[PDB]
Design an enzyme around this catalytic site. Structure first.
Site, PDB file in Angstrom:
ATOM      1  CE1 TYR A  27      -4.243  -1.584  -0.016  1.00 37.56           C
ATOM      2  CE2 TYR A  27      -2.985  -3.249   1.190  1.00 37.56           C
ATOM      3  CZ  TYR A  27      -4.104  -2.882   0.454  1.00 37.56           C
ATOM      4  OH  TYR A  27      -5.088  -3.808   0.173  1.00 37.56           O
ATOM      5  N   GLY A  29       2.357   3.901  -1.639  1.00 40.12           N
ATOM      6  CA  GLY A  29       2.513   4.364  -2.999  1.00 40.12           C
ATOM      7  C   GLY A  29       1.094   4.498  -3.510  1.00 40.12           C
ATOM      8  N   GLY A  31      -2.442   3.820  -4.845  1.00 40.55           N
ATOM      9  CA  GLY A  31      -3.291   2.645  -4.847  1.00 40.55           C
ATOM     10  C   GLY A  31      -2.770   1.547  -3.939  1.00 40.55           C
ATOM     11  CG  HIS A  47      -2.488   8.448   4.018  1.00 38.15           C
ATOM     12  ND1 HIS A  47      -2.352   8.705   2.681  1.00 38.15           N
ATOM     13  CD2 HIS A  47      -2.545   9.657   4.639  1.00 38.15           C
ATOM     14  CE1 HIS A  47      -2.327  10.018   2.481  1.00 38.15           C
ATOM     15  NE2 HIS A  47      -2.443  10.610   3.654  1.00 38.15           N
ATOM     16  CG  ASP A  48      -3.888   4.148   0.108  1.00 37.18           C
ATOM     17  OD1 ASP A  48      -3.309   5.243   0.059  1.00 37.18           O
ATOM     18  OD2 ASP A  48      -3.475   3.125  -0.460  1.00 37.18           O
ATOM     19  CG  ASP A  89      -2.111  14.370   4.322  1.00 39.53           C
ATOM     20  OD1 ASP A  89      -2.567  13.291   3.897  1.00 39.53           O
ATOM     21  OD2 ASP A  89      -2.011  15.396   3.627  1.00 39.53           O
TER      22      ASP A  89
END
Length: 124
Positions: A27, A29, A31, A47-48, A89
């Site tokens: 994960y 990076g 996508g 975070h995604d 973030d």
């Protein structure tokens, strides 16, 4: 914005997000698929998921405001949606910092898609 996210990572984790977290595990990076492989990878997974739940604004290009007080990163502004992006973030930056103890680029950098099967994709 993503440039701000890079800034928070360097401020909190004291590392370059681009150079240490842009292609780590499944994960870290753009996508992601499969299972988060370790602590750092799960930070990215979360975070995604956090970005995926933001509705009303754009986590990639919108700019949020923050200040530093009582030894922390304080997300502010008059826009609740942008504050939410900042929280995502901020949380990730702290997560990277708190898990530097197990960071292992030799094993997880450019992990490969086969190692991140779509069928093992953990749902948010």
């Amino acid at each position: 914005s993503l440039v701000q996210f890079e800034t928070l990572i360097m401020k909190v984790a004291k590392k370059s997000g681009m150079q240490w977290y842009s292609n780590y595990g499944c994960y870290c990076g753009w996508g992601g698929q499969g299972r988060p492989q370790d602590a750092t990878d799960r930070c990215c997974f979360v975070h995604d998921c956090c970005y995926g739940k933001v509705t009303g604004c754009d986590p990639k290009m919108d700019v949020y405001s923050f200040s530093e007080e009582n030894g922390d990163i304080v997300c502010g502004g008059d826009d609740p949606c942008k504050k939410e992006i900042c929280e995502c973030d901020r949380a990730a930056a702290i997560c990277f910092r708190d898990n530097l103890n197990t960071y292992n680029d030799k094993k997880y950098w450019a992990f490969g898609a086969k190692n991140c099967p779509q069928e093992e994709s953990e749902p948010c």
